[PDB]
């Protein structure tokens, strides 16, 4: 399925407080959501800018600073959600951006 | 598996804001978590009481007031998470409490 419902789980600290999630229609939209979450963090540091560019290493460092980050992707074959860890998310984003033109 | 990792997804309103989740070692612990979430809500309404009892209909009304509530239960056979909706959670809690002695 090109578009599989995806659930992003964000765990900022080691505790049960502040754990949040978001729902997306696809893995692609989900990966953009991870990037949008970083962009929003950056926008808080530069309140007057329309958008802040960044390198992937900062984004990955950011993802690494979370107590945890993971996603769940719906699989039509089993009607269940396949889980993927933070490293899988980073690779995914990497490949999706590397598709600047590679 | 008597103890399957369970993820509780709470969506208080129709929007992406405020969606939160919690991780539990079993479906049982998860159902207690749903009840604990209501109890904490009740404790805010009666700040001086150690604990507030309630009937199941109020708890269910409460669950029904959420834009959404669902859980995901890990299945060792497929290494994926089985999703269940709010009605499944309510029945589950119902049966677990009905086990006062029935």
Chain B residues lying within 8 Å of A9, measured CB to CB: 7, 21
Chain B residues lying within 8 Å of A25, measured CB to CB: none
- Domain borders along chain A are 1-102
Q: How far apart are CA B33 and CA B92, in angstroms?
A: 13
If DSSP states are collapsed to H, E and C, what string results for chain A?
Answer: CCCCCEEEEEECCCCCCCCEEEEECCHHHHHHHHHHHHHHHHHHHCCCCCCCCCCHHHHHHHHHHCCEEEEEEEECCCCEEEEECHHHHHHHHHHHHHCCCC
Contact predicate A72/A83, CB 8 Å: yes
Using CA atoms, how far residue B60 sits from A14, A75, B6, B34, in Å, is 30, 30, 20, 10
Query: Residue B77's closest chain A neighbor by CA?
Result: A78
Of the CA atoms within 13 Å of residue B26, those in its CB half-sphere come to 7
What resolution in angstroms, rounded to 1 decimal? Answer: 2.1
Q: How far apart are CA A4 and CA A2, in angstroms?
A: 6
SS3 B49: coil
Q: How far apart are CA B26 and CA B6, in angstroms?
A: 6
Tokens of A64: 């690494």
| Long-range CB contact pairs, B30-34, < 8 A, 24+ | B30/B6, B30/B71, B31/B89, B31/B92, B31/B93, B31/B96, B33/B8, B34/B8, B34/B63, B34/B69, B34/B89, B34/B93
CA distance A49 to chain B (A): 23
Q: For chain A, positions 76-95, list CB contacts with chain B under 8 A.
A: 78, 80-83
> A1-102: which CATH architecture?
2-Layer Sandwich (3.30)
Phi, psi (deg, nearest 5) at residue A88: -65, -40
């Amino acid at each position: 399925a090109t578009m599989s419902h995806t659930i992003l789980l964000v765990q900022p600290t080691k505790r049960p407080e502040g754990r949040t999630y978001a729902d997306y229609e696809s893995v692609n939209e989900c990966m953009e959501g991870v990037c949008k979450m970083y962009e929003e963090h950056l926008k808080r540091m530069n309140p007057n800018s329309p958008s802040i560019t960044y390198d992937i290493s900062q984004l990955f460092d950011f993802i690494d600073d979370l107590a945890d980050l993971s996603c769940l992707v719906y699989r039509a074959d089993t009607q269940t959600y396949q889980p993927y860890n933070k490293d899988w998310i980073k690779e995914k984003i990497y490949v999706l951006l590397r598709r600047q033109a590679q």
